[PDB]
Design a binder for this molecule. Structure first.
Ligand SMILES: NCCOCCNC(=O)[C@@H]1CCNC(=O)/C=C/C(=O)N2CCC[C@H](C2)C(=O)N[C@@H](Cc2ccco2)C(=O)NCc2ccccc2CC(=O)N1
Length: 164
């Protein structure tokens, strides 16, 4: 019964394809529900039109700051921040979907998709899903990043929603 959601991504207006994500509501229901609702936009806000603002090759692709588009913003469906739900799931390799944060219990809407095993984040960021389809799209996104995280193209979530 875990939901499937999708992000359609383009770079400087050129479509990259669709990333499909399974959300592990069986393990982190509160975190999964937040992401699902931000994909559908059913609360009146969410990810559509927001960007991957920080992309670091051989690390991760970060997105979801739909208020400030720069890593300082975002908000969850519960409020501006909500706590770390649990650290049961681990950053085991590429395709892991995990919450960005600025310290303990600062989850909002920002998230990242790993391109390697980021196991030093275990117990520090809440893992809540993984890529079902479209790792090749993620690798395309990654190819527009840099060591600093600055991107070389504008990477936009042109559509998102829930598949099941
Ligand atoms: N650069 C070349 C060096 O390469 C080595 C690899 N670098 C690493 O491992 C680095 C090493 C240490 N730097 C950082 O923490 C970068 C901080 C950074 O950018 N700020 C600008 C934006 C506002 C501040 C500060 C912030 O903190 N905003 C949140 C996003 C967020 C806000 C509210 C909820 O969520 C964020 O962005 N958290 C960072 C993040 C996000 C996702 C996954 C992991 C991590 C840890 C990480 O990236 N750690």
């Amino acid at each position: 019964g875990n939901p499937l959601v999708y992000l359609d991504v383009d770079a400087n207006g050129k479509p990259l394809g669709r990333v499909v994500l399974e959300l592990k509501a069986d393990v982190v229901p509160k975190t999964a529900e937040n992401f699902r609702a931000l994909c559908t936009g059913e609360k009146g806000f969410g990810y559509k039109g927001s960007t991957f603002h920080r992309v670091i090759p051989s690390f991760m692709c970060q997105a979801g700051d739909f208020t400030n588009h720069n890593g300082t913003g975002g908000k969850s469906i519960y409020g501006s921040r909500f706590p770390d739900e649990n650290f049961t799931l681990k950053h085991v390799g590429p395709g892991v979907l995990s919450m960005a944060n600025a310290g303990p219990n600062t989850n909002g809407s920002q998230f990242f998709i790993c391109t390697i095993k980021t196991d030093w984040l275990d117990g520090k960021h809440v893992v809540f899903g993984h890529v079902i389809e479209g790792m090749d799209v993620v690798k395309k996104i990654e190819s527009f990043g840099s060591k600093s995280g600055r991107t070389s193209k504008k990477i936009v979530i042109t559509d998102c929603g829930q598949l099941s």
